[PDB]
Amino acid sequence: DRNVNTFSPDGRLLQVEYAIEAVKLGSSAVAILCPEGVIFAVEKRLSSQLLIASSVEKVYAIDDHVGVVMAGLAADGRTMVEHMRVEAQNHRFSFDEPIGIKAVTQSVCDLALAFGEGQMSRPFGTALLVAGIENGKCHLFHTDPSGTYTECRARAIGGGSEGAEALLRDLYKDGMTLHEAEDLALSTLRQVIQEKLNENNVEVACARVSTGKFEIYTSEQRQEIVARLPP
Amino acid sequence: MLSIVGLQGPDWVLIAADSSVSSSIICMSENYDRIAQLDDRHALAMSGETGDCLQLSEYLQGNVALYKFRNGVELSSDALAHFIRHTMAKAVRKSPYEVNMLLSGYDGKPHLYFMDYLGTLQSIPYGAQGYCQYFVMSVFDKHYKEGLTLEDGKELMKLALNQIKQRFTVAPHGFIVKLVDKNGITKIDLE
């Protein structure tokens, strides 16, 4: 009935809130930032064993230094990833430097409210966790369909986002190691999903300060993290 | 204005092209394929700026493939020739494709089309674009028999290409010659 651009009497953008709900319906993704980098651990919802897990990607390498992990509508997150990649390469071309993590996050969020009626028809149904290395510093941001990016040290988006926040509230510390960050991300993901966490149903990535690179973990690295998990 | 020659036979078309590409006075390559196989049935010899012949070849081959995929059928040699002529006429009105072509084809029957940059489409038994048309025509005229055997046709094409090599001042280092027949397009060596 009412336009997608309608504000609710409370003052909330109804379509933005509904897109946030769509995000809440997405696969769980946990970004844990440690002084040694930042780790994405996202649930891959393998609906079938014939589904190629490598093709079901929530983690996208925006650039060599920055990447994103999605929660919600995978295609909308794909469009946001396309914009972020174009903008990271455009920044590299325009300024001969890697795009800042805040810069690329803000760039993708400027596209979030670009929907309208009477441009996009609707908000993005995907929330992002953008983690990267800017000038040797690990940065992590979370973007919701509202286009509100906030820098995070430990965030979770998707199905168990509230539960993941509750778990991290007393599990995340600011002085963890990269190994500890991996353990915390994978554990929070396991505790906020409805399946078991193996190297095939989880996608892990690291924006690493040591290498200054956003590398999505191979199967062996995910297996190592899974094995090291205490439970 | 590179040398491309064509020789339609009873059931084949020998389509030769200057195989040497040059950057001004420098012969950059000696095996450059100027006969763009638009289809398994059609080889379009092109004569002109290498970068306009490449772009026209890519467009024409992509449109032939698009016709074949969008419509399950393939373009006829006449239909493809007229599509190329339509492209060239639109261009010459807007931005001429400075590419003179010989469209050899075999859609069940051999076809050879003179296709100037303007959009002059003409079915020919033999022909040439470039300055080689001033050197090869008489050869063909003096030696083309109706119903040539493919080997007699190869000898005739060798005759025309040797005429280019011997009498054309800007003589190609060599030619890439392709046979377009019921077996498709095959790079044949005239020896």
Binding site: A61, I62, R85, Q89 | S23, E49, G51, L54
Partner: protein, 202 residues
Amino acid sequence: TTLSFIYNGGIVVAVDSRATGGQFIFSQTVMKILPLAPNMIGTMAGGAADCQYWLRNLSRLIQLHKFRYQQPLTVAAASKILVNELYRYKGYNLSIGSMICGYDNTGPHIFYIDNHGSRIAGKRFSVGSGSTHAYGVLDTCYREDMTKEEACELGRRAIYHATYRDSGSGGRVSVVHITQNGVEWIDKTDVFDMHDFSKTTF
């Protein structure tokens, strides 16, 4: 003078470093090899701004394709991207003479690209005012079964002779050796050091 040749050991790309507007040498340290991908470089010949901007833009497009798609972008693909971008400016008086050289799944590849839209695959190319002299060195001294040192020296010497016989070529030969293992920036050698002053014929 830029040049790039494929031999059994890989691609040797040797470029001079002279930027000359008119008769004045504006630079002798300009970088005429631009790395496009880990295993692929592009050479610069013609308009310096055109060559460097468009090789940089080709690098951006290659990176965009790399991040967008798992399928590696071949050297043929990079050359085709660059030649389509340059043909987009056909009639704009761009001046790019480049060799997109590198290793892909199919092995070594050199594609000479120019603003005119030409895209010629080959095992041996030389672009620039001194290209004829570098060709004189390459076509004569080139062997497929050269050593890495011999091939790098062949490219270096072709560029050096082009610099000697070409006013528009000079500076230092930057020699890169591309293999399946990536682009190896062999070295920058001053052609002044390469000149044999014992010899008196040239």
